[PDB]
Amino acid sequence: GKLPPGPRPLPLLGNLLQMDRRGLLKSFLRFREKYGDVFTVHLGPRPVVMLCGVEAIREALVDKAEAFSGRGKIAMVDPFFRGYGVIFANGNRWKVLRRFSVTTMRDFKRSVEERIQEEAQCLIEELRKSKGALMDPTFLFQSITANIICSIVFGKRFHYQDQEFLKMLNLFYQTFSLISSVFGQLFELFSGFLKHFPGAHRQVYKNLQEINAYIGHSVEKHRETLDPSAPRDLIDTYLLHMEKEKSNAHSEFSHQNLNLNTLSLFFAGTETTSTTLRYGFLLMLKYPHVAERVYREIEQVIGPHRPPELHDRAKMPYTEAVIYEIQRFSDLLPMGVPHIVTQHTSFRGYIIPKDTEVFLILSTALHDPHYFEKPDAFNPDHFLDANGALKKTEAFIPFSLGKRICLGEGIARAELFLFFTTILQNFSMASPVAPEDIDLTPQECGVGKIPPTYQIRFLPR
Numbered sequence: 001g002k003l004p005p006g007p008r009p010l011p012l013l014g015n016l017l018q019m020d021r022r023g024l025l026k027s028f029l030r031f032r033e034k035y036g037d038v039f040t041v042h043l044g045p046r047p048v049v050m051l052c053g054v055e056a057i058r059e060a061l062v063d064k065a066e067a068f069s070g071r072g073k074i075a076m077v078d079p080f081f082r083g084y085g086v087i088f089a090n091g092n093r094w095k096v097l098r099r100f101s102v103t104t105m106r107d108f109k110r111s112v113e114e115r116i117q118e119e120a121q122c123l124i125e126e127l128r129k130s131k132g133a134l135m136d137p138t139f140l141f142q143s144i145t146a147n148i149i150c151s152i153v154f155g156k157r158f159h160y161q162d163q164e165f166l167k168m169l170n171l172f173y174q175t176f177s178l179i180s181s182v183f184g185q186l187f188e189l190f191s192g193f194l195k196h197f198p199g200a201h202r203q204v205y206k207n208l209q210e211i212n213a214y215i216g217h218s219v220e221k222h223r224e225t226l227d228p229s230a231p232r233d234l235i236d237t238y239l240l241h242m243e244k245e246k247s248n249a250h251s252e253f254s255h256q257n258l259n260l261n262t263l264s265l266f267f268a269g270t271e272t273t274s275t276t277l278r279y280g281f282l283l284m285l286k287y288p289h290v291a292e293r294v295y296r297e298i299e300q301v302i303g304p305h306r307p308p309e310l311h312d313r314a315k316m317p318y319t320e321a322v323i324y325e326i327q328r329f330s331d332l333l334p335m336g337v338p339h340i341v342t343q344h345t346s347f348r349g350y351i352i353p354k355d356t357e358v359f360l361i362l363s364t365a366l367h368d369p370h371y372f373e374k375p376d377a378f379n380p381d382h383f384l385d386a387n388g389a390l391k392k393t394e395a396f397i398p399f400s401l402g403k404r405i406c407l408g409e410g411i412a413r414a415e416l417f418l419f420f421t422t423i424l425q426n427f428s429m430a431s432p433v434a435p436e437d438i439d440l441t442p443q444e445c446g447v448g449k450i451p452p453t454y455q456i457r458f459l460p461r
């Protein structure tokens with residue numbers, strides 16, 4: 001009959017005065033205590049329905065896909081993306097851009113696996129050259145994941161010591177942080193007001209323009225050398241489609257979709273997997289007995305030299321459990337990416353009007369103590385049975401579900417496994433901080449959950 005229950009709002013401020021100072025997620029976990037798994041919070045001027053736990057989330061994204069499949073905005077980046085590109089598009093643009101992006105990622109020329117394998121070898125050579133010196137591995141982790149996207153999109157990889165590559169990686173890093181910051185969460189509530197003032201939203205806008213400028217230039221160099229009978233990469237393929245549909249003024253294959261879809265694939269392609277890697281190696285420093293056990297399995301299944309391959313996974317249940325647990329623990333996007341309802345819909349008795357924003361709080365499925373005993377601790381046994389065999393679970397939804405499910409899922413799982421195991425096959429880790437002193441508390445927790453900076457050494461075996 002009405003919207004899910006929640007804290008009683010004030011006219012201008014919504015539920016501001018009921019929020020927790022520590023962020024949106026914390027705010028929402030407190031409301032969930034009081035209201036249950038389906039509730040409404042007024043984020044500044046508008047109601048947003050929160051869905052918590054695997055059942056409710058899957059009931060919405062899978063059983064009710066006809067309605068929960070729209071994409072909402074992220075205040076901090078809407079001014080840039082404006083509903084262009086696969087992540088932020090709706091309706092028929094999304095359908096075109098999704099089919100195109102899914103279809104030209106898989107089809108191309110090396111397999112996905114081969115490209116990751118080569119990149120893993122370049123990574124190992126790089127880590128060798130560093131001769132056990134301390135670094136903050138953020139740049140390398142962004143470099144190897146960026147290079148996978150790059151070879152699909154630009155037809156090329158960049159070298160780790162290229163200062164122009166590094167400068168773009170810095171912008172991806174700064175932006176993800178700024179977006180996930182306390183100001184970014186405030187902005188989600190009050191963009192309407194805050195936009196008129198200086199603040200992080202302008203820096204994010206400017207960073208994204210700067211990345212936009214490289215992509216515009218690359219599109220140009222491609223157009224100039226384009227061979228219709230032999231498209232090199234995803235940009236070439238988009239250009240061909242642009243040609244084919246030029247007589248339709250309403251073609252989705254526009255120039256803004258070109259730039260912003262590409263940029264969307266890049267952002268998501270780089271920052272998601274690299275952040276998981278960052279948390280992953282920090283977790284390894286804090287739990288060296290886990291890293292040592294992963295290494296014993298690599299030794300026994302793969303050996304000290306033969307490059308790891310995807311077909312190794314099924315024979316490495318421990319390593320897979322550690323990687324699942326890294327993802328579960330990391331909780332990359334704790335509230336997922338905003339959805340909206342596309343038509344009036346009933347959900348557990350409530351009525352959700354059309355164009356009502358919905359957050360699926362993926363963090364609540366990942367921390368569900370019915371599936372994961374002691375869900376706030378890192379523990380790979382979360383994903384092992386009695387016999388040490390891999391135990392997958394329905395609650396494991398860090399890619400979300402349904403029509404909008406991460407389209408990069410397969411690529412990211414390939415990268416996490418090949419980069420994790422290839423590094424561990426060749427190196428052990430050390431740092432100047434004892435495992436008991438290692439603090440896992442995120443540096444940011446908003447849209448994204450971002451681990452603190454740290455120094456690590458990679459020691460050759």
Ligand code: HEM
Nearest residue numbers: 087268269272273276332337398399400404406407408412
């Ligand atoms: C650890 C790595 C990753 C995680 C945890 C992750 C997670 C997610 C999540 C939660 C969503 C939101 C789905 C929803 O709207 O309900 C998403 C969407 C998306 N992701 Fe991933 N992602 C990862 C890696 C990647 C990679 C490597 C790519 C590209 C190569 C990618 C590309 C995308 C795109 C294009 C969307 C939007 C899909 C759509 O709206 O139709 N992601 N991702």
Ligand SMILES: OC[C@H]1O[C@H](O[C@H]2[C@H](O)[C@@H](O)[C@H](OCCCCCC3CCCCC3)O[C@@H]2CO)[C@H](O)[C@@H](O)[C@@H]1O
Nearest residue numbers: 146150158164165166168169211213214215216217266
């Ligand atoms: O397009 C106009 C702009 O061009 C110049 O910037 C160059 C720089 O001179 C040049 O150093 C830079 O090189 C960047 C190469 C690395 C790009 C790698 C990433 C790009 C996309 C996401 C993944 C990979 O590209 C920029 C864009 O062409 C000028 O310096 C700018 O001031 C100007 O506004």
Ligand SMILES: CC1=CC[C@H]2[C@@H](C1)C2(C)C
Nearest residue numbers: 077087179267268272337
């Ligand atoms: C896959 C992710 C989608 C939404 C968040 C991160 C990448 C971006 C695009 C800011």
